[PDB]
Design a protein around this ligand. Structure first.
Ligand SMILES: *[C@@H]1O[C@H](CO)[C@@H](O[C@@H]2O[C@H](CO)[C@@H](O[C@@H]3O[C@H](CO[C@H]4O[C@H](CO)[C@@H](O)[C@H](O[C@H]5O[C@H](CO)[C@@H](O)[C@H](O)[C@@H]5O)[C@@H]4O)[C@@H](O)[C@H](O[C@H]4O[C@H](CO[C@H]5O[C@H](CO)[C@@H](O)[C@H](O)[C@@H]5O)[C@@H](O)[C@H](O)[C@@H]4O)[C@@H]3O)[C@H](O)[C@H]2NC(C)=O)[C@H](O)[C@H]1NC(C)=O
Ligand SMILES: *[C@@H]1O[C@H](CO)[C@@H](O[C@@H]2O[C@H](CO)[C@@H](O[C@@H]3O[C@H](CO[C@H]4O[C@H](CO[C@H]5O[C@H](CO)[C@@H](O)[C@H](O)[C@@H]5O)[C@@H](O)[C@H](O[C@H]5O[C@H](CO)[C@@H](O)[C@H](O)[C@@H]5O)[C@@H]4O)[C@@H](O)[C@H](O[C@H]4O[C@H](CO)[C@@H](O)[C@H](O)[C@@H]4O)[C@@H]3O)[C@H](O)[C@H]2NC(C)=O)[C@H](O)[C@H]1NC(C)=O
Ligand SMILES: *[C@@H]1O[C@H](CO)[C@@H](O[C@@H]2O[C@H](CO)[C@@H](O[C@@H]3O[C@H](CO[C@H]4O[C@H](CO[C@H]5O[C@H](CO)[C@@H](O)[C@H](O)[C@@H]5O)[C@@H](O)[C@H](O[C@H]5O[C@H](CO[C@H]6O[C@H](CO)[C@@H](O)[C@H](O)[C@@H]6O)[C@@H](O)[C@H](O)[C@@H]5O)[C@@H]4O)[C@@H](O)[C@H](O)[C@@H]3O)[C@H](O)[C@H]2NC(C)=O)[C@H](O)[C@H]1NC(C)=O
Ligand SMILES: *[C@@H]1O[C@H](CO)[C@@H](O[C@@H]2O[C@H](CO)[C@@H](O[C@@H]3O[C@H](CO[C@H]4O[C@H](CO[C@H]5O[C@H](CO)[C@@H](O)[C@H](O)[C@@H]5O)[C@@H](O)[C@H](O)[C@@H]4O)[C@@H](O)[C@H](O[C@H]4O[C@H](CO)[C@@H](O)[C@H](O)[C@@H]4O)[C@@H]3O)[C@H](O)[C@H]2NC(C)=O)[C@H](O)[C@H]1NC(C)=O
Ligand SMILES: *[C@@H]1O[C@H](CO)[C@@H](O[C@@H]2O[C@H](CO)[C@@H](O[C@@H]3O[C@H](CO[C@H]4O[C@H](CO)[C@@H](O)[C@H](O)[C@@H]4O)[C@@H](O)[C@H](O[C@H]4O[C@H](CO)[C@@H](O)[C@H](O)[C@@H]4O)[C@@H]3O)[C@H](O)[C@H]2NC(C)=O)[C@H](O)[C@H]1NC(C)=O
Ligand SMILES: *[C@@H]1O[C@H](CO)[C@@H](O[C@@H]2O[C@H](CO)[C@@H](O[C@@H]3O[C@H](CO[C@H]4O[C@H](CO[C@H]5O[C@H](CO)[C@@H](O)[C@H](O)[C@@H]5O)[C@@H](O)[C@H](O)[C@@H]4O)[C@@H](O)[C@H](O)[C@@H]3O)[C@H](O)[C@H]2NC(C)=O)[C@H](O)[C@H]1NC(C)=O
Ligand SMILES: *[C@@H]1O[C@H](CO)[C@@H](O[C@@H]2O[C@H](CO)[C@@H](O[C@@H]3O[C@H](CO)[C@@H](O)[C@H](O[C@H]4O[C@H](CO)[C@@H](O)[C@H](O)[C@@H]4O)[C@@H]3O)[C@H](O)[C@H]2NC(C)=O)[C@H](O)[C@H]1NC(C)=O
Ligand SMILES: *[C@@H]1O[C@H](CO)[C@@H](O[C@@H]2O[C@H](CO)[C@@H](O[C@@H]3O[C@H](CO[C@H]4O[C@H](CO)[C@@H](O)[C@H](O)[C@@H]4O)[C@@H](O)[C@H](O)[C@@H]3O)[C@H](O)[C@H]2NC(C)=O)[C@H](O)[C@H]1NC(C)=O
Ligand SMILES: *[C@@H]1O[C@H](CO)[C@@H](O[C@@H]2O[C@H](CO)[C@@H](O[C@@H]3O[C@H](CO)[C@@H](O)[C@H](O)[C@@H]3O)[C@H](O)[C@H]2NC(C)=O)[C@H](O)[C@H]1NC(C)=O
Ligand SMILES: *[C@@H]1O[C@H](CO)[C@@H](O)[C@H](O)[C@H]1NC(C)=O
Ligand SMILES: *[C@@H]1O[C@H](CO)[C@@H](O)[C@H](O)[C@H]1NC(C)=O
Ligand SMILES: *[C@@H]1O[C@H](CO)[C@@H](O)[C@H](O)[C@H]1NC(C)=O
Ligand SMILES: *[C@@H]1O[C@H](CO)[C@@H](O)[C@H](O)[C@H]1NC(C)=O
Lengths: 139, 451, 235, 139
């Protein structure tokens, strides 16, 4: 275990842990609450690099976390979707990918049409599914 | 088979990108003596616990010449140096005609007793006082010699603050959230390539900004025999970094007993001139254990053997061309800036398979503008008292043998032409990556039908 | 995905012992297992043992766990996902029943349900544990037995008689010509001497200006002589 | 379609799409990861306007997204509530508003007591509803 501890292991192992990566993603001991505590101008070059790094920290976290909210998966770490898998994406079989490719390799295998999957993802799970209440919310 | 897509938040995948990093260091200067030029009045404190994970099964490829952590390092030091000189005494009034004389030839003369006319506290009145200056920092104009500061011709001048430490202290570079720094834990790492032993430490090791020329000090050394790294070997032109396995100890000391003479030039501002010397004039020197040096120079030609024409003739020459301040082992020590003659170390040549100690002559300069920066130069005030530095020498910098088309032999003379390569000797193993926690994968699993 | 190629043809006296090698490429050599299987003349392919390049735990069959010890070194990375490696296998004391063809093959998957089975196979190595001595082959020309050459194209070849041990192939000068040529299987005489034949399917036109030199590369004998076909001919 | 593509269409159409507005709300191509990449002082007037604009970006996104979390609607884009509609708000009928007013007009029709609705919203759906486990969580 550890942060990215299973980065080189098979995809089945990264499926098993996963939180250790998600936990250490927003806040860090490195930030350490700023201030010297314990000259009186904090306009130094260091303060500029820190604050612009604290911004992109939450700017990149919220850019990805906004994606989880529009897919109905905000509350959980792994959610299933109602989008069928299209064979043009990969020809490999069920146990052939989860035990032989590792995630590091997999991100390069879908990076071509990865944005296209994201487009179809907002539709089937939250554009129609959240709409389907119309008939079932009350009759 | 009705395979459905499923999302996974926190997937261990990354892509090479370079973001803005920041400082980290614990209790250093503090109360007794602070105001360090680099660590400022406050850096974010480093965690006492360092986090290193031996990433398994991974073989990420590094590149130390196309790595941007060294370029971020370069522009940070420049902006950090200029910020530590901006609020201080400017020495614009120091540009007057200087009438100077030798010192005690006794009819041996390398400093001059300068008399000149300078503004006082009151703008109306003027004052004449003496001061001593080193050679080359002043030049003649056209019976009684007449001189001028070498920088008044070029750019402006600003005195270094009196209570500022130019001592390199460890500065840690660490990543921003969603980022990680990858460490090459492979001992042998010829140039750069796929590293089998990677770690994803959140924070680098203790990196000291040792401002050095040609030869590196207080650096990091891998355990194997001396490493040789070139962006491209055989492109005679590209410079060569050299990592030792065991560092040599070189101690330097300035025997001059400088007295402090503070003369005001207007209000609050006070120029710190060299006073009158106490004791016989002695040239500054550097000691190198001749025994320790002969073997370090030998292990390199053994490693260089397998990289340059196998078994043939490898010679070492003195710098070769260039300017006086870049061809000598320049550095800072205690506040005064030394320039030592390296021709005494790169003269031997071995090929075909209580104790004496080499010494190096050194001169001192008080006028400096480093990193070939023609914007503004600074005057380093003379350090009152005794001077002694004792730092390990861990790295080296080499250069060409001209353009010998094939032929008989190869020679490598030192040439610390640039400053950014000095930090590349400390950053060969690191590289930062951007974590992408979003991964999508198929599995025969779908959520509830209606909702 | 990467051709694991086996270097072989090494064969010695019974009981001498030998080590075989298999050069890998095109895959992470680190964590796929590598197996050893052979087929003997009496049929029945027999799995020898599997070995993991990581950690090093191996489980060899009980029928060979006392006389066969196999080891393997590390690999040099090429990219983040490929590498080049090699595997070795040592055996002790052998007889004619140990003669046959030997394959090394990459373990199928990187998981826990089934890995010990091979996936991608080496080119194979022919081992001969015969008590007979080494003999250089004899080259003989193939006569121009008349064959229809409508369109100006006809087949030919070169004959090989009485050789030993192990078989070998027939090539051509500077390569180039590999498609549409058919050399025939080896033959075992009742005398114990092997032989073989080659027949090329290329345009022959009229004998003379075209190239008719058949190239032969071999075993303990090696090669130096590569003979052409004699000119006197029919039709 | 497109960003605000149905801003002028009836409320029934904005109900149908809606994500295109929600998607392009936090991150933009305009931000474009800052830095020049490809003088050494980034204190320029431009850097001040950009960073203060990146802050109010997530400051306004999180101010509204915090409201969705205290209503039990964080995971989804459209959630139903257990607050009855009070007739003093509008006298119009079910099909009379969704097919004749457009959202742009509607926001002006409730802006008077819109904050009062928000107050009642935290209560019935999350102050009582999340509390109702007391009896049903375990008996
Ligand atoms: C990245 O690095 C990692 C290392 O960090 C590499 O990981 C290695 O990957 C290989 C790939 O094959 C593994 O090899 C074998 O794994 C087998 C797993 O079997 C388990 O799962 C199957 C189903 O998938 C179950 O059927 C098995 O048994 C179940 O059912 C039984 C009933 O039939 C039950 O009785 C049983 O309780 C269980 O429910 C089982 O769960 C494994 O069997 C096989 O074992 C061989 O090697 C062993 C080495 O040590 C293992 O076993 C000991 C105990 O003996 C444990 O204490 C260790 O933790 C470890 O599990 C050896 O002891 C056995 O005798 C066998 O010779 C193989 O282990 C490797 O396990 C795995 N690495 C490690 C650390 O073991 C990875 O390959 C690499 N990169 C990539 C991408 O490949
Ligand atoms: C590569 O790395 C090497 C190794 O780090 C590095 O070399 C160091 O360089 C730094 C400067 O860059 C040196 O630090 C300076 O030291 C000056 C001289 O004093 C030194 O030695 C003192 C010896 O004290 C012992 O003996 C005395 C009696 O003789 C006794 O009282 C003591 O108790 C002790 O037994 C030592 O004390 C002193 O520093 C500590 O203690 C004194 C009080 O004792 C205190 O005043 C200090 O603040 C400190 O806590 C020091 O080690 C020193 O003058 C200088 O500046 C200080 O003093 C001046 C004097 O006026 C003040 O004006 C100023 O405000 C400061 O307070 C500074 O501390 C260091 O010694 C070198 N090496 C060692 C041994 O660590 C190389 O530079 C690096 N490479 C490069 C790029 O150069
Ligand atoms: C970098 O450059 C700077 C430049 O400033 C250097 O700093 C300078 O260093 C020099 C070193 O020589 C200093 O000169 C000193 O001046 C003081 C003060 O002047 C009084 O004494 C003078 C004596 O005459 C000198 O020269 C004769 C020549 O033979 C010598 O014999 C004698 O020893 C002296 O060196 C007086 O002329 C002067 O006049 C008034 O008082 C007199 C007192 O009686 C003196 O003279 C009589 C004869 O008249 C003698 O018998 C008697 O013994 C005594 O010497 C009086 O008679 C006269 O009528 C007047 O009333 C002063 O009293 C001297 O005391 C030192 O001996 C020396 O000459 C510079 O002052 C100094 N610069 C400054 C800032 O002033 C700096 O050193 C250099 N860098 C280094 C290496 O540090
Ligand atoms: C580089 O140059 C500098 C500047 O000269 C050197 O700095 C001085 O060096 C000397 C010699 O190495 C040091 O040693 C001695 O210090 C004695 C103490 O003086 C200090 O404390 C005094 C307290 O009282 C003492 O003196 C009184 C008399 O006034 C006595 O009654 C009493 O018992 C004490 O002994 C202070 O009053 C004084 O101001 C100092 O702070 C000195 O007394 C001694 O003086 C002798 O030598 C002098 C020349 O150096 C000479 O002029 C005198 O007449 C006398 O013969 C001597 O100075 C100093 O400690 C040291 N510091 C300072 C600030 O002066 C430095 O050493 C040199 N580098 C090298 C290579 O040595
Ligand atoms: C030139 O080179 C010589 C030879 O290296 C140096 O002499 C060594 O100086 C170093 C540092 O200046 C000393 O190094 C270390 O001292 C440690 C002190 O112990 C503990 O506490 C400190 C303070 O909290 C911690 O920082 C430290 O980590 C320890 O917890 C030793 O414990 C170290 O030894 C072992 O553990 C560390 C822990 O990570 C490892 O990193 C080390 O590799 C090692 O396994 C270490 O010894 C050292 O004692 C001096 N002697 C020797 C023979 O090394 C000169 O100082 C140096 N000059 C310069 C300026 O470069
Ligand atoms: C500092 O700033 C000054 C002023 O701006 C710069 O100028 C020189 O300053 C020095 C003093 O340090 C001058 O030299 C001195 O001149 C004194 C008198 O000058 C007048 O007479 C001179 C001739 O001397 C006769 O008269 C004197 C009267 O005392 C008698 O003692 C002599 O015996 C002679 O009879 C003339 O040349 C001069 O022009 C005046 O009329 C003199 O008494 C001193 O002994 C000394 O010589 C010097 O003249 C100033 N100008 C020059 C030409 O340099 C100075 O350069 C600045 N800094 C430096 C570099 O020192
Ligand atoms: C490269 O290194 C070589 C040595 O490996 C070196 O050659 C040596 O140079 C030194 C210094 O020039 C020579 O030593 C001199 O020898 C002459 C007689 O040949 C003596 O007269 C000299 O004595 C005077 O100078 C000494 C100081 O240099 C004083 O201490 C002494 O009192 C005298 O005034 C002096 O001993 C030496 O002979 C050669 N040769 C050898 C084999 O040592 C070469 O110069 C170096 N080149 C560079 C540019 O570094
Ligand atoms: C560190 O070690 C690395 C790993 O070995 C080095 O990387 C290797 O760098 C070489 C040169 O850049 C790559 O390619 C080589 O190409 C030469 C030239 O081949 C051509 O000419 C020869 C005759 O001169 C001829 O025989 C060929 O057919 C070609 O026409 C080859 O001779 C080499 O065999 C080799 O292919 C390597 O591919 C590359 N290795 C890899 C993949 O890592 C690296 O250069 C070393 N140095 C540094 C500073 O990193
Ligand atoms: C740098 O200057 C220092 C002195 O300030 C010189 O250091 C001293 O070097 C000698 C070399 O013989 C050391 O002598 C021996 O040291 C060993 C321990 O290493 C000790 O067991 C012996 O009894 C003897 O003292 C001496 O200790 C050492 N001093 C210290 C404390 O470092 C040094 O040699 C100079 N550099 C060069 C170029 O030599
Ligand atoms: C997958 O989608 C692409 C693009 O619409 C289409 O060309 C392809 O036929 C689809 N494959 C199937 C049948 O899932
Ligand atoms: C270095 O070598 C050159 C000849 O290449 C020589 O002229 C010069 O005097 C030597 N000394 C230095 C340190 O320049
Ligand atoms: C001289 O250096 C050698 C090697 O470092 C050392 O063993 C010896 O003790 C030193 N000098 C003497 C004679 O002590
Ligand atoms: C709506 O609420 C207001 C304020 O409490 C109240 O005056 C009004 O009578 C309510 N109307 C109904 C009956 O929903």
């Amino acid at each position: 275990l550890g942060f990215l501890g299973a980065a080189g292991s098979t995809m089945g192992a990264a499926s098993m842990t996963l939180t250790v990566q998600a936990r250490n993603l927003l806040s860090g001991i490195v930030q350490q609450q700023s201030n010297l505590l314990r000259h009186l101008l904090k306009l130094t070059v260091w303060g500029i690099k820190q604050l612009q790094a604290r911004v992109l920290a939450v700017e990149r976290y919220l850019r990805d976390q906004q994606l989880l909210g529009i897919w109905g998966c905000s509350g959980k770490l792994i959610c299933c979707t109602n989008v069928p898998w299209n064979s043009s994406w990969s020809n490999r079989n069920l146990s052939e990918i989860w035990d032989n490719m590792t995630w590091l390799q997999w991100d390069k295998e879908i990076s071509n049409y990865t944005q296209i999957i994201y487009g179809l993802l907002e539709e089937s799970q939250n554009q129609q599914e959240k709409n389907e209440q119309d008939l079932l919310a009350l009759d | 088979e009705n395979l459905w897509v499923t999302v996974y938040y926190g997937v261990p995948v990354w892509k090479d990108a370079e973001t803005t990093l920041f400082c980290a260091s614990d209790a250093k200067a503090y109360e007794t003596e602070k105001h360090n030029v680099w660590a400022t009045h406050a850096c974010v404190p480093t965690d006492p616990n360092p986090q290193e994970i031996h990433l398994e099964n991974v073989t990420e490829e590094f590149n130390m010449w196309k790595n941007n952590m060294v370029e971020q390092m370069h522009t940070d030091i420049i902006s950090l140096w200029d910020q530590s000189l901006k609020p201080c005494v400017k020495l614009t009034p120091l540009c007057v005609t200087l009438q100077c004389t030798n010192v005690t030839n006794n009819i041996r003369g390398e400093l001059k007793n300068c008399s000149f006319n300078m503004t006082t506290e009151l703008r109306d009145k003027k004052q004449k006082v003496y001061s001593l200056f080193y050679r080359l920092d002043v030049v003649q104009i056209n019976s009684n010699k007449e001189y001028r500061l070498i920088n008044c011709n070029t750019s402006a001048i600003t005195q270094a603050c009196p209570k500022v430490s130019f001592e390199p202290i460890p500065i840690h570079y660490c990543a921003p959230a969603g980022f990680a720094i990858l460490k090459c834990k492979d001992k042998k790492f010829n140039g750069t390539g796929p590293c089998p032993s990677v770690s994803t430490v959140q924070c680098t090791h203790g990196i000291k900004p040792v401002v050095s020329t040609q030869l590196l000090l207080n650096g990091s050394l891998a355990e194997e025999e001396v490493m040789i790294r070139s962006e491209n070997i055989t492109n005679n032109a590209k410079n060569i970094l050299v990592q030792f396995n065991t560092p040599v100890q070189i101690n330097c000391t300035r025997p001059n007993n400088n007295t402090r003479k503070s003369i005001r030039i207007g209000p609050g501002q006070a120029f710190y001139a060299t006073g009158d010397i106490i004791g016989d004039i002695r040239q500054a020197h550097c000691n190198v254990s001749k025994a320790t040096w002969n073997e370090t120079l030998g292990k390199v030609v053994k490693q260089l053997r397998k990289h340059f024409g196998n078994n043939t003739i490898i010679r070492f020459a003195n710098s070769s061309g260039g300017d006086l301040e870049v061809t000598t082992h320049s550095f800072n020590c205690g506040g005064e800036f030394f320039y030592c003659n390296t021709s005494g170390l790169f003269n031997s040549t071995w090929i075909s398979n209580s104790n004496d100690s080499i010494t190096l002559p050194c001169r001192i300069k008080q006028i400096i503008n480093m990193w070939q920066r023609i914007g503004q130069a600074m005057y380093a005030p003379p350090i009152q008292g005794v001077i002694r530095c004792v730092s390990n020498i861990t790295g080296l910098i080499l250069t060409r043998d001209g353009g010998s088309t094939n032929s008989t032999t190869e020679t490598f003379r030192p040439g610390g032409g640039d400053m950014r390569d000095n930090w590349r000797s400390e950053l060969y193993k690191y590289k930062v990556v951007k974590i992408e926690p979003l991964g999508v994968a198929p599995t025969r699993c779908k959520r509830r039908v209606v909702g | 995905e990467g051709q694991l190629v086996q270097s072989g043809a090494e064969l010695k006296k019974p009981g001498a012992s030998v080590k075989i090698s298999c050069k890998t490429s095109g895959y992470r050599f680190n964590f796929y297992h590598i197996n050893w299987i052979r087929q003997t003349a009496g049929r029945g392919p027999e799995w020898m043992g599997w070995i993991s390049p990581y950690s090093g735990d191996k489980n060899l069959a009980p029928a060979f766990q006392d006389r066969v010890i196999m080891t393997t070194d590390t690999e040099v990375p090429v990219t983040s996902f490929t590498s080049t490696g090699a595997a070795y296998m040592e055996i002790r004391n052998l007889k004619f029943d140990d003669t046959g063809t030997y394959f090394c093959a990459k373990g199928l998957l990187r998981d826990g349900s089934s890995t010990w089975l091979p996936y991608l196979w080496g080119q194979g190595t022919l081992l001969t544990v015969s008590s007979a001595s080494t003999k250089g082959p004899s080259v003989f020309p193939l006569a121009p037995s008349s064959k229809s050459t409508s369109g100006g194209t006809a087949a030919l070849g070169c004959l090989v008689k009485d050789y030993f041990p192990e078989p070998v192939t027939v090539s051509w000068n500077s390569g180039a010509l590999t498609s549409g040529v058919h050399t025939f299987p080896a033959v075992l005489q009742s005398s114990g001497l092997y032989s073989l034949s080659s027949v090329v399917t290329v345009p022959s036109s009229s004998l003379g200006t075209q190239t008719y030199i058949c190239n032969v590369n071999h075993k303990p004998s090696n090669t130096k002589v590569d003979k052409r076909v004699e000119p006197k001919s029919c039709d």
